[PDB]
Design a protein around this ligand. Structure first.
Ligand code: CLA
Ligand code: CLA
Ligand code: CLA
Ligand code: CLA
Ligand code: CLA
Ligand code: CLA
Ligand code: CLA
Ligand code: A1EB4
Ligand code: A1EB1
Ligand code: DD6
Lengths: 172, 197, 158, 156, 143, 33
């Protein structure tokens, strides 16, 4: 807090660093990415459209074809990458656009960061579209991402399929 | 205000107004409605004279664009509203580009302003000698031309009714009883600009 | 009665989910009015095309409103896209100016009153008639498209 | 120079028969001078264009020389729209010049701020006389191209 | 005559009143552009600059890029225009940070609030102009 | 699978990191007392 405010005054002026704004935004991103992980699980389940066995040739994608160890980049990774790039373009338009209908990514001119604190953020009495409940949901989503990453790394299974243990028959 | 003109006999000497319309807005809305009524009337009377010329096979003794090959003779061979579909493709452009020029001038270049705010509706007399290239009204008194304007409005309404009847009879057979069947009045019943679009 | 931001045309204080901040009220009204106007035009066009009105020509005939979108997209809907975007650009100017500052420009008031019908004594009734018709037409067009998507297109969509 | 306006050439002087400029407001004079100068400039462009495009037309290849055929045989609709957009931009700037309270009529350079000599009036008269000549020449060129079907450097 | 005179009636300022600097045509052009037009908030100035610039910037990447002879030429050009627009937006933000510090704000462009509004308008306008020119370029056979 | 790490790290590091460092360094240059 004040340690990071004194350590990085330029960075803590604009709300960056360990602040409540950063953690709320990261929780929202974790929620949408949980939805995206579930959607990609459905994508491998149904086989809506992308196939991940064919390759990306040089003659249609340039130097963004064969890149790692002279290894082909597949159409599934390319499709998910293109979707992520479009999400990032919408993200840049929202971050550097007019601040309408939205909490700002950064802090504006001389405004203090909010503080719904944390600890346990009482669920009863804060139901609905309240900042404390959305905050709790994003915090739980970030912890779910951390737990899924650790479980997949330990078990040696796919990140999309280590959650398939905890669903049972679901999507894929 | 609904004092204006067009209220006379055969309607009770009162405003014919079942639906609101006249009270849908204010004074400027009435001026716009009167300008629309007068312009609609004049267009209908002109269309009626042109349609009567077309039925009686009164065409110009010219050629109408020798490059295309269309002549005035086979523009009268076909029925009404199909002759407009055969006026090449530059002729529709020229008839049009002439008519917006008149519309833009008739609204813009008024020393008193638009008919909604200053100036009577149906008065493009600021276009010099446009209404009267000869004199015709040049010695007529004001009391005469007021009655003539009233006759203008009545004949315009009648011509609107008549051209609607002609379009309906050319479109839906048996709509007009006196028209019934006819040798002419055979065609699409409507004319799109530039033929198809 | 949710907050004090309400109190305008078509207000019955209906906000159960509470999606109305002090800032997001003018944008909410502008979005509702834009959706309502586009839905009135959309429902009228869908019904009128399915009722029998056709563009004169062999291409635009034999087509219902459901299977019209993938036929005229590259040729006829492009002109509508150009004109709608042309109007929406100046609309964007006015809307953004209203959003940041400019203490006039009530949401929906684009100034498009050419006939000057607001000079009538029934102007507030025109306001609530517009809003009620916009809500009814959003519901009506959503109904029409979701019913016609489930097989039975016809005219009556049931 | 009569009434503050250049003109009045030697072969025929203040050329106002029919009384178009008798007892007329200076606004009417400004409108008439704007019309005359814009006609002259458009007609100089037209005359030079037909003369050059009769014998030197490299922009699209073989493109004929009958001037009404030139505008329709090619020049795709985007090109005509771009020409119209350019001309509309210049006409909007003409309107904005006409609204200014220093409006010399055919003047986009705004020469009222700088000092002027009779040589400036002589050059303005040169522009006006060349403009009028090109007015007549452009009408004649279009008439020949319709009657015969050949351009200006053709027909000879 | 003399068409080159001291600039703004001051003979010792480092400028001249040539027919390029002080013509009425140049004043009408450079007094009605978005950065100079009267009665414009900084956001609208940035928006009107941005749409033209984005249209422009998606111009050269599609035709001359490394993937020009590819079925994905227009998409790659759009993405390259998006990246250049993001770089220009970052440059505008860091210029505003370095230039306008401890300012009062307001509708003036030379302030923190004004430059933030200008940068936001430029970014959203540039992304929109690139997208619009993508849409027009994908259906270029319409014209 | 270690065939992704070049294509991930090399653009991130080589492009994104010095661009942010140039922007941050320029801002730190031009801040005054
Ligand atoms: C792919 C996952 C992901 C995504 C999309 C984001 C996205 C974001 N993070 Mg983030 N973050 C992540 C993983 C991620 N983070 C991880 C793993 C950590 C380590 C715990 C952090 C730690 C972190 C901090 C400390 C901060 C952000 C901030 C931000 C925001 C601005 C970042 C920026 O300046 O751009 C470049 C943005 C919403 C900043 C923010 O929101 O400030 C308001 C901020 O201060 N993040
Ligand atoms: C990168 C994400 C991020 C960020 C910036 C914060 C930021 C914060 N957390 Mg937090 N938190 C997070 C993720 C995050 N949290 C997650 C995923 C969990 C779940 C384990 C928690 C659980 C948590 C608790 C239980 C508490 C905080 C508290 C705090 C505050 C001070 C301590 C601190 O800096 O923690 C980093 C600060 C607002 C404390 C607080 O309320 O102080 C105001 C506190 O008691 N956090
Ligand atoms: C609504 C008005 C209207 C419209 C759309 C038309 C449309 C047409 N007329 Mg027509 N016409 C009209 C009124 C109209 N007329 C009137 C009022 C008269 C009586 C003077 C005529 C007398 C007339 C003749 C004598 C001829 C046409 C012809 C034609 C056709 C070829 C175009 C042409 O040469 O225009 C010419 C149109 C005019 C000279 C009318 C101008 C009327 C204004 C008010 C000025 C007076 C075209 C279908 C030609 C044809 O082939 O038809 C069979 C032809 O030879 N018209
Ligand atoms: C939300 C508004 C909206 C939209 C998106 C459409 C969209 C469409 N209409 Mg439509 N229509 C509307 C409102 C709308 N309409 C209304 C309100 C009416 C009644 C006045 C109509 C009456 C109508 C008819 C009669 C026909 C269409 C047709 C069409 C289709 C061809 C597009 C075209 O050429 O139009 C371009 C229009 C313009 C450029 C005009 C701009 C103003 C397209 C799916 C045609 C079709 O293909 O049907 C199958 C057709 O025949 N419409
Ligand atoms: C339409 C173009 C046009 C216009 C608007 C003007 C306008 C003007 N001229 Mg001008 N002029 C023109 C063409 C034009 N000229 C041409 C072509 C010539 C060469 C013969 C001249 C030669 C000329 C001289 C030598 C002088 C002027 C002067 C003037 C100014 C005052 C006279 C006046 O009131 O005229 C008003 C003019 C009009 C209202 C235009 C009338 C257009 C009619 C309707 C044309 C009718 C047809 C026509 C007779 C023949 C054309 C058809 C033919 C191709 C077959 C005024 C600004 C005087 C001046 O500058 O004073 C300082 C002066 O001394 N003019
Ligand atoms: C060493 C780091 C590095 C890397 C990884 C790249 C990567 C790339 N360069 Mg590049 N370049 C670099 C340094 C680098 N450059 C330097 C130092 C110079 C100057 C000498 C250039 C000059 C250069 C030119 C002149 C061109 C490239 C092109 C390309 C692209 C190759 C063509 C292709 O397949 O994609 C095709 C491109 C796409 C599919 C678009 C991808 C969208 C963008 C790039 C992603 C967004 C990135 C984001 C904005 C980064 C933010 C940075 C900011 C935070 C500081 C690729 C994106 C070509 C290119 O971009 O094609 C138009 C091209 O024409 N480069
Ligand atoms: C100073 C030593 C050094 C140098 C010059 C390089 C150089 C390179 N490494 Mg690398 N690397 C190093 C140490 C070094 N490595 C160490 C110790 C590790 C183990 C963690 C790695 C792990 C590593 C991976 C996994 C990958 C590279 C890759 C690369 C290449 C692309 C650049 C890049 O993305 O790096 C990214 C490197 C890192 C994120 C690791 C940090 C590197 C060291 C620890 C930092 C040393 C800083 C050095 C002292 C300079 C200080 C001044 C500086 C701030 C200006 C490039 C040839 C990529 C490759 O193979 O491309 C073909 C790639 O995918 N490196
Ligand atoms: C060179 C030219 C010089 C002269 C210029 C010049 O001519 O001037 C033009 C001019 C003038 C003039 C003057 O200025 C002049 C020259 C001198 C000046 O002192 C005086 C004035 C006057 C100012 C006036 C023009 C008047 C016009 C055009 C009136 C046109 C009017 C059309 C109508 C009524 C249409 C009617 C349609 C009908 C009856 C159709 C129909 C029907 C129904 C109604 C449907 C009913 C029924 O249906 C059923 C029941 O089945 C039968 C049916 C089918 O029949
Ligand atoms: C056309 C633009 C006109 C500009 C505007 C204008 O001047 O307005 C005047 C105007 C109307 C009007 C108005 C007034 C009522 C009069 C006044 C109003 O005043 C106000 C303020 O209200 C304004 C307005 C606009 O309402 C209309 C002017 C129309 C004009 C000047 C029309 C030229 C056609 C020439 C043709 C068709 C040539 C065909 C040539 C063709 C089709 C060929 O085949 C040539 C050919 O070579 C080809 C290709 C191959 C060769 O082998 C064979 C030949 C040699 C045969
Ligand atoms: C208290 C204290 C100490 C401490 C501590 C501790 C324990 C600190 C722990 C911090 C911790 C544990 C921080 C986790 C963050 C997780 C994040 C940010 C996840 C983001 C995930 C996001 C934003 C979502 C990303 C994606 O959605 C995207 C964008 C697309 C999807 O396709 C993929 C996914 C879903 C992944 C010390 C060490 C003792 C020293 C000192 O005393 C101070």
């Amino acid at each position: 807090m004040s340690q990071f405010a004194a350590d990085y005054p330029w960075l803590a002026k604009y709300g960056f660093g360990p602040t409540v704004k950063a953690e709320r935004w990261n929780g929202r991103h974790a929620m949408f990415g949980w939805l995206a992980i579930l959607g990609t699980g459905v994508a491998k389940s149904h086989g809506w459209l992308p196939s991940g066995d064919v390759a990306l040739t040089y003659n249609e994608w340039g130097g963004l074809a064969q890149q790692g160890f002279n290894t082909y980049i597949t159409n599934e990774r390319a499709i998910i990458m293109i979707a992520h790039v479009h999400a990032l373009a919408v993200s840049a338009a929202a971050a550097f656009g007019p601040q309408v209908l939205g909490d700002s990514l950064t802090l504006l001119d001389g405004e203090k960061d909010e503080d719904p604190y944390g600890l346990f953020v009482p669920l009863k009495g804060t139901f609905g579209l309240t900042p404390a409940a959305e905050m709790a949901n994003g915090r739980m989503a970030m912890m779910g991402i951390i737990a899924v990453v650790l479980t997949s790394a330990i078990s040696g299974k796919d990140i999309l399929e280590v959650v398939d243990i905890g669903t049972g028959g679901n999507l894929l | 205000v609904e004092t204006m003109e067009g209220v006379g006999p055969e309607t009770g000497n009162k405003v014919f107004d079942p639906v609101g319309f006249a009270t849908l807005g204010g004074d400027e809305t009435l001026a716009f409605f009167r300008h629309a009524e007068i312009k609609h009337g004049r267009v209908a009377m002109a269309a009626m004279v042109g349609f009567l010329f077309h039925i009686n096979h009164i065409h110009f003794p010219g050629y109408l664009s020798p490059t295309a090959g269309v002549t005035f003779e086979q523009l009268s061979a076909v029925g009404p509203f199909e002759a407009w579909n055969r006026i090449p493709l530059l002729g529709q452009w020229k008839i049009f580009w002439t008519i917006p020029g008149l519309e833009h001038g008739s609204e813009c270049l008024d020393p008193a302003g638009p008919y909604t705010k200053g100036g009577p509706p149906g008065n493009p007399k600021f276009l010099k000698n446009f209404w009267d290239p000869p004199g015709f009204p040049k010695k007529l008194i004001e009391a005469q031309k007021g009655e003539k304007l009233f006759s203008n409005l009545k004949n315009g309404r009648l011509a609107m009714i008549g051209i609607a009847s002609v379009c309906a009879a050319t479109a839906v057979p048996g709509s007009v009883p006196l028209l019934a069947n006819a040798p002419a009045l055979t065609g699409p019943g409507f004319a799109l600009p530039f033929g198809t679009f | 009665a949710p907050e004090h931001l309400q109190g305008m045309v078509g207000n019955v204080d209906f906000d159960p989910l509470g999606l109305s901040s002090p800032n997001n009220i003018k944008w909410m009204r502008e979005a509702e009015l834009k959706h309502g106007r586009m839905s009135m035009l959309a429902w009228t066009g869908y019904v009128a095309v399915d009722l029998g009105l056709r563009f004169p020509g062999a291409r635009y005939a034999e087509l219902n409103s459901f299977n019209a979108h993938d036929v005229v997209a590259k040729k006829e809907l492009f002109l509508l896209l150009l004109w709608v975007g042309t109007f929406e650009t100046i609309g964007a100017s006015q809307i953004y100016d209203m959003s940041i500052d400019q203490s006039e420009r009530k949401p929906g008031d684009f100034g498009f009153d050419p006939l000057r019908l607001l000079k009538s004594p029934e102007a507030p009734k025109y306001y609530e008639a517009e809003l009620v018709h916009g809500r009814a037409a959003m519901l009506a067009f959503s109904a029409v498209v979701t019913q016609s998507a489930l097989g039975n297109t016809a005219f009556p969509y049931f | 120079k009569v009434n503050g306006m250049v003109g009045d050439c030697k072969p025929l002087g203040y050329f106002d028969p029919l009384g178009f400029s008798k007892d007329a407001s200076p606004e009417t004079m400004a409108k008439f001078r704007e019309a005359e100068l814009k006609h002259g400039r458009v007609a100089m462009l037209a005359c030079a264009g037909m003369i050059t495009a009769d014998k030197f037309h490299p922009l699209f290849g073989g493109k004929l020389s009958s001037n009404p055929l030139l505008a329709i045989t090619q020049v795709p609709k985007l090109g005509l729209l771009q020409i119209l957009l350019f001309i509309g931009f210049m006409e909007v700037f003409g309107i904005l010049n006409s609204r200014r309270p220093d409006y010399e009529p055919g003047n986009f350079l705004g020469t009222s701020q700088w000092e002027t000599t009779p040589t400036w009036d002589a050059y303005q008269l040169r522009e006006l006389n060349n403009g009028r000549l090109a007015m007549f020449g452009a009408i004649g060129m279009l008439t020949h191209a319709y009657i015969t079907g050949k351009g200006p450097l053709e027909l000879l | 005559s003399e068409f080159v005179k001291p600039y703004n009636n001051d003979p010792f300022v480092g400028n001249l009143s040539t027919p390029v600097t002080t013509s009425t045509a140049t004043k009408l052009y450079l007094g009605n552009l978005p950065i100079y037009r009267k009665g414009l908030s900084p956001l609208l100035r940035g928006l009107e600059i941005g749409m033209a610039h984005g249209y422009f910037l998606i111009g050269p990447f599609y035709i001359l890029g490394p993937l020009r002879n590819s079925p994905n030429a227009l998409l790659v050009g759009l993405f390259s225009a998006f990246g250049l627009i993001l770089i220009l937006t970052l440059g505008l933000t860091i210029y505003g940070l370095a230039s306008f510090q401890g300012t009062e704000g307001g509708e003036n462009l030379e302030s923190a609030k004004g430059w933030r509004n200008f940068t936001s308008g430029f970014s959203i306008g540039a992304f929109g102009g690139a997208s619009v020119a993508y849409v027009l370029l994908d259906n270029i056979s319409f014209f | 699978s270690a065939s992704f790490l070049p294509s991930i790290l090399t653009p991130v590091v080589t492009l994104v990191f010095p661009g942010l460092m140039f922007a941050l360094f320029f801002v730190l240059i031009e801040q005054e007392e």
